[PDB]
């Protein structure tokens, strides 16, 4: 529910930011071209972002992809997931983030401080699902799992929320999320989509590797889920904002100045990980950066771990991916058996 | 039979001008004509001897441009269609234009305020026809909501239409989820705001289009075209006393690079009287460039071009069209997407030379001016274009064609 | 076929306006149109969206008027033709007008400088036709010298022509020595200066005359008349947002005595919405006059009159003609020779009431406004005038009639 | 001889002054309406001018018609026939008198200090002229007379000169005078026209009166010529200009300020002359004002006296008069026998 007048105003705002993101991006700056997510392969932009280390974009934002500085800021407490400051280009464009982004940035900020059942007792319910995956199995896993600790369609409409906070979605897509967006439950909806693509990417990675395929059936592993969230994290980008001025490699980061941690880039540094862009289940390199308070990451890793173990029996069409997801990189169609 | 005609342009002096002679054409026919636009364009409407209906409020471009828009001026100068490269026809590239130009330009003009302003006036004044500048999307929306017949009136090439037709042409190759259409999404959710009809490409292009350009230099779009004999309007025109006399020697007039404007010496090596449209301010640094050169500031092109053997200009519609109708060979110095495309079309036809400004050399200009003056082919080419244009109906005759079309 | 048309007016904003829609009519037909006048009229020409050819130098009226001319303003307000008294038709009286108005007005405008300026432009530009305001004698002289066809374009009544026809009508009664003709003497010795043809009354009246006034309210002169459907031009017109809506109650609009402007209270006793063309400056003293009255300053009459049941005005051509074409009954408040004559003609026809301002009473106005609103006769009269005018060709059609006439 | 350009400029000037004279005149002021001379009868304007006494016009000019003040200024030496000052309305009108009036005002200023033969020896030559009058007798008298002390046609073209000094004539009429205008000879041309209308008015007055008709034949008189130049003077108006400021009845007359003596009005004052507008040959009233140095008046009175005596034998159509002559009031056609 919302008037066709404010709808019109919102649509105009979402379209202006994306328009400026693409313009800035096509002109040179790689962070807004990534933010548009017009490509399915972001790995060359991540190399360029890591190569630079730290660079602030055309928008005010500081882009941290060097694993050394990425860990440095994620560990620093000044950098938080709160409402920062409005950059001049945005208010001048007539699209304050406080308007086009607002529900979605409160979702990113939400913390799920609840008991996380990692029992694997979940994998018991999850067994009878694949008969003798995006919506028929992967999205089925968080719903039935959180039910045995949040409606299917409701969570599916809100699934774009953690992209919408940095990247403007379509008007109907933005509209459907706000209407289906509920604190903890809000944060649980977010984790549901985090878990959902983890299941897809894992089954996709297992499908290619010769070992992982028949090996997962031998011991139903947490190691595959760990490695998958390195090459394909829950959140590729991590929006943070400084409360007090911070010094990161000779750079002064002001109060309310936004910093975005490029986790997917960081998690493939040639100096930190051996064969980074290669799927290695048995790798000593466990210095991977992720996610800030709460245990939502711990919740998804459990839902995905239980899921991978249940589908260990079945493990031995064209894959379409969501095109406006620079943060979480979701799949929409994953065929078949 | 008597009609209520609305003419709508975006708040640009550079855009209104292309509608002026046809607005006056309708009113001389005895019809009621009102130019509905934003308060900024009011002085320019009244300076065209036309009645202004200023609707809505102004848009703060100065603030938008200083902080956001300037980069989009840098983005636009990149795009080049005059050569038809396969690289520019990729889905990624085309959706790019659609994603950036839709909000930062088309919808930046046509704001919230203007569209409700026009929809209000049309509902009240009850027009019989709406003629609009090709990038003022408020007018077709108002015309759609009111159910009023509407038509576009072009000036330069219909490059946006060609870019759009290509963009839509690739939409089917892309998967259902990867599909997008910013201009349609915007106009659709706009039509809903006034409860108007369903979206139709008829809101983007008109129900018909009027083009003062000769048939051969028009892009292939398939749209219902009404050709029109071009009649120049370029704001306040005052003829100087020096332009009364028939010229002595042959004349080349130069109108506005990387040549440090010291290029005047290059056209000076040409065997002809040169008329430079530069003011004493613009040529404050030039000390040895004039010899056969005359600097007279801004003068009426529709009064100067009839006296020129050749012309050197930026490629602007006013200069292009006026020279074209007078069979005056052209040396175009383009810098825009719209100018390059047309400069290339006119060179292919042999009515002149296209000299892109990034690649431009003073040797190229001296040779090009010498080429149009001496080769009887460029004149012959320019003669065909002129003859094509004089065979199209005058804005006077176009009033009846609109009148008829407006009915069905 | 393509033509070079010259339009000439004297340096008066009040006079140029009557030529504007026909100039634009010609240019929309694809013809070359230039408005040749003195440097003073340039801003007004360009503000009509027309091309100005400023020729010659300006005339210092400010000095002439302060010391000599002011008395002639007092002389003119005396003359009254609307009643046709035998006293005004005496040779002494008529030669009087001819002796005073010929130098102090006709020839005061049309100065030494302008005539040589126009003769120079015409010799050079080689026009095919010259259309002029009825009292700019420089244009027919230039047209006579060049041998170019020329025609007059009237606005109000042709009172000067009628006064002249009467003056010439008495010349034979007077002895050979007592005969005189200031306008002929002036034009004759002017035609000699450019070696031009012998004097002909064709230099005073045109070769034909165009009148936007209905056949019945035109004076009998016998001159070749081309009637024309009137299309209003009155300078920069901007429609206010309040004039978009269809009125609620019936409307009477009042446009500009000895009544201390406190007359607003008299029209206030009328059962209607009154729209007063007065600014907040003009009504700084009025404190109790408004009740049903609306003060909106100068607004477009061609946009206001279509919404009025009746109108109260000074008798000016713009107000007269615009109201006339819209079948709007009139209450004219004349003060000039030109306005009284026409105000009398329109009252005789029954399209309104003529209230001379020297004799004017607030009781007369209240009664007159009540009379036009309630008696269906004034509307019926105004309906006939309107119907006469809509049966005349539009300025668009008049272009062909001129084109043909210009040939022979 | 003169260019069609300066001709055009002159014509425009003559037409502007007359235009303003008529405008000012029709508006009220009687002096410029008289100056136009559109009427043949000026006697009501002269009554109004005398009634006032002294009044300055719309132009700068002082109008003196009261016989008391008329004699007062004609006798005062400050008031002279020289070039005065240009009034603001004229230069603003663009017609300085120094341009449109100039030759003609030098004619008025001219003095004929030559021997005046009043012998009446002239009346001997003048005898055989009328067979058994404007051009066939009256204009014939000065030519043959000045020859026996100046060509016929030459003097006839210049005849408008003393009107042209105050009243603008037609362009061709002004043109023909300047070309036919020669000092003394210049002043003699002027006296020729002065004599010419005197002969016409005298024969016209004699023609009506019963006595004068057959009485002139008895004693061929100077008394008739005297009385005629009272009711019909040589110059009705007399242009003068102050050199030094003069006080005339409470009025300050500035230097170079023009004064015009209305001689024809003055010569019919009811308080000065008995039955003034009545032709009385035997009247004691010889206090009539006339003409300043020279003897031109004495020359004309002699040419006219000789003329009246010669035509004493013949003495016992419509009369057309020159229409732009407020100064000298000439006749153009005087039929018949």
Numbering used by the authors:
A (entry chain B), D (entry chain B): 20 to 151, 158 to 174, 180 to 212, 215 to 252, 255 to 325, 330 to 354, 360 to 380
B (entry chain A), C (entry chain A): 19 to 274, 285 to 436
Which of the paper's sentences describe this entry?
For example, the in vitro activity of the GT EryCIII, which produces erythromycin D (3) using TDP-d-desosamine (2) and 3-α-mycarosylerythronolide B (MycEB) (1) as substrates, was enhanced by the addition of its auxiliary protein EryCII.
The structure of the EryCIII·EryCII complex was solved at 3.1 Å using data derived from crystals of both native and selenomethionine (Se-Met)-labeled proteins. In the difference density map of the refined EryCIII·EryCII complex, residual density roughly the size of a sugar could be observed in the putative catalytic pocket, which is likely to be due to the binding of a small ligand that originates from the E. coli expression host.
